[PDB]
């Protein structure tokens, strides 16, 4: 007679049924999955089938109204750690799964929860009324675990591994409010979810592992622990990612950006190399040719060097041109080392070596102003320091290096240079908008400045930051594979990031933007004491990502 305070790893507890669990469902499922041949990996005494293994944990507080959604999960073999490994050698799967819930409360609390299975074809989100489905009610004072089973309600005969199809969804909601009769600061409890395959889960058709690999099915391995710790760079400045920058207003980034369709709207490959263009007018203001600023420009839509697009040459920064003249260093400009070369043979001009500032302008021989849309604009170079002589050749070419630094007037630092007001964008790209409490984020990096090249992180003169939209391994991996059959429009792919003290969640949309649920805060996330990164899977987009650092 064991007590209920100790639970065994094979123990389901109380089995809570629902009207969707029927015998004819199981018989039809087995008899129609039989077209894939005999079932595989169905030995009932194996250790990977008999035990429950960890899936998730969530929080239930007293401020949650009835009908609030606390936890959702889509039907997949990626919810178990061992059926995700075994799916690399098979081409189909069919069957159900069991989910075990443990509520960590006491006998003094009040309140109840509700769980139901949602058939495919129904949108999951706020306004989904769970209590008018066939449901099970679970008390907050329960000591033994409660397990319900999600069956396979599908319109196919089996699920192909790349393209499963329509699946059911398990949703847990709030029946009645949580009550603490004492009242005070202690108002929250925690529930843990675990998973185990059911008795009719199987695979069917064996295949070579050197077929469609694990990097073409789900983008779970695109974001790992060393990517955000010490290996990955950003897609704008090619610098070490140190933090996360919330943007509560919104932004749109076009160049060197990839969606979940294997497509780009920009004009750059996913690599950092030289910027080369020819056939552009070069000039210099004034008459004296010693210590004279150098000017160069060319129109947009003419650079025939890229197989991708001809808006700008490969590697051009997507920043609007800040206008300047005279002996004044501009504020927050993309500057980089380079020189102007001779278009007839390729011989560079040796005396015209300086740091040139790049951007997008509207009138280059006339008055100078920044511009954002690429239609009717042009690409403009102008050196920030004094250079010797100037070539007035009409087809003259420009050669700049890959990486750049910030142009600052003084030795002190400023805010993140790439603010969302001035980002040059091709017309036709979508923007990133806040969805509820979730707001778009960028990836911060320590980038040197032209007023103090010795300055690093933690310096006494301030730290200079430059931001990008995606990490570089992510956009490299997004241009090699296709993930159309991994995320519906209106969903996020969620990763859990743990720290030494707290943990937070980030999500990736179909458009290729990253999100975090922080509201209207503008504080940088430190991202120094990060420990582990774990994938979670598809979740509804109108659900708050958990953000607590403590």
């Amino acid at each position: 007679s064991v007590p209920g305070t100790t639970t065994d790893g094979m123990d389901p507890g109380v089995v809570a049924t629902t009207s969707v669990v029927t015998a004819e469902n199981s018989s039809a499922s087995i008899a129609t999955a039989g077209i894939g041949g005999p079932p595989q990996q169905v030995d009932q005494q194996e250790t990977w089938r008999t035990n429950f293994y960890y899936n998730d944990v969530f929080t239930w507080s007293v401020a949650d109204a009835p009908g609030s959604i606390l936890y959702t999960v889509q039907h997949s073999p990626q919810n178990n750690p061992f059926t995700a490994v075994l799916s690399q050698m098979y081409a189909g799967w069919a069957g159900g799964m069991q989910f075990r819930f443990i509520v960590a409360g006491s006998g003094v609390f009040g309140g109840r929860l509700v769980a139901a299975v949602i058939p495919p074809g129904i949108e999951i989100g706020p306004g989904l009324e769970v209590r008018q489905f066939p449901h099970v009610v679970i008390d907050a004072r329960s000591l033994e675990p409660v397990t319900i089973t999600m069956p396979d309600l599908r319109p196919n005969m089996y699920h192909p591994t790349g393209d499963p199809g329509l699946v059911p969804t398990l949703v847990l909601s709030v029946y009645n409010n949580l009550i603490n009769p004492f009242g005070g600061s202690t108002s929250a409890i925690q529930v843990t979810v675990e998973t185990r395959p059911s008795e009719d889960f199987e695979f069917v058709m064996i295949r070579a592992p050197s077929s469609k690999t694990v990097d073409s099915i789900s983008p779970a391995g695109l974001l790992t622990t060393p990517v955000l710790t010490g290996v990955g760079n950003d897609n704008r400045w090619n610098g070490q990612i140190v933090g996360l920058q919330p943007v509560p207003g919104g932004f749109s980034t076009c160049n060197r950006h990839w969606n979940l369709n294997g497509s780009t709207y920009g004009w750059s490959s996913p690599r950092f190399a030289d910027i080369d263009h020819r056939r552009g007018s070069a000039s210099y203001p004034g008459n004296n040719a010693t210590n004279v600023l150098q000017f160069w420009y060319a129109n947009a839509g003419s650079a025939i060097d890229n197989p991708i697009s001809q808006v700008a040459p490969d590697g051009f920064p997507d920043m609007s041109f800040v206008p300047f003249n005279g002996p004044g260093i501009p504020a927050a400009g993309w500057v980089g080392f380079g020189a102007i070369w001779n278009s007839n043979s390729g011989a560079p001009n040796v005396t015209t070596v300086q740091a040139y500032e790049l951007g997008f302008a509207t009138g280059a021989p006339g008055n100078l102003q920044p511009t954002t849309n690429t239609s009717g604009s042009q690409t403009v170079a102008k050196s920030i320091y004094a250079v010797v002589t100037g070539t007035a050749q009409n087809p003259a070419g420009l050669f700049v290096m890959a990486s750049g630094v910030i142009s600052t007037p003084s030795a002190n630092a400023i805010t993140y240079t790439p603010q969302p007001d001035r980002i040059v964008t091709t017309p036709g790209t979508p923007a990133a908008a806040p969805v509820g409490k979730n707001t778009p984020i960028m990836f911060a990096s320590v980038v040197r400045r032209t007023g103090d090249v010795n300055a690093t992180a933690g310096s006494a003169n301030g730290t200079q930051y430059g931001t990008g939209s995606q990490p570089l391994p992510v956009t490299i991996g997004l241009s090699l594979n296709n993930y159309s059959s991994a995320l519906m429009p209106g969903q996020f792919f969620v990763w859990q990031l743990t720290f030494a003290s707290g943990f937070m969640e980030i999500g990736l949309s179909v458009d290729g933007y990253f999100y975090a649920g922080t509201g209207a805060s503008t504080t940088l996330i430190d991202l120094t004491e990060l420990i582990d990164v774990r994938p979670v899977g598809p979740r509804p987009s109108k659900s708050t990502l958990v953000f607590n650092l403590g």
């Binding site: 004819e24 018989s27 039809a28 087995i30 008899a31 129609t32 039989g34």
Partner: peptide, 10 residues
């Protein structure tokens, strides 16, 4: 599995 084919036969 047998009940499915049995029902379709019957």
């Amino acid at each position: 599995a047998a009940e499915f084919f049995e029902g379709m036969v019957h």
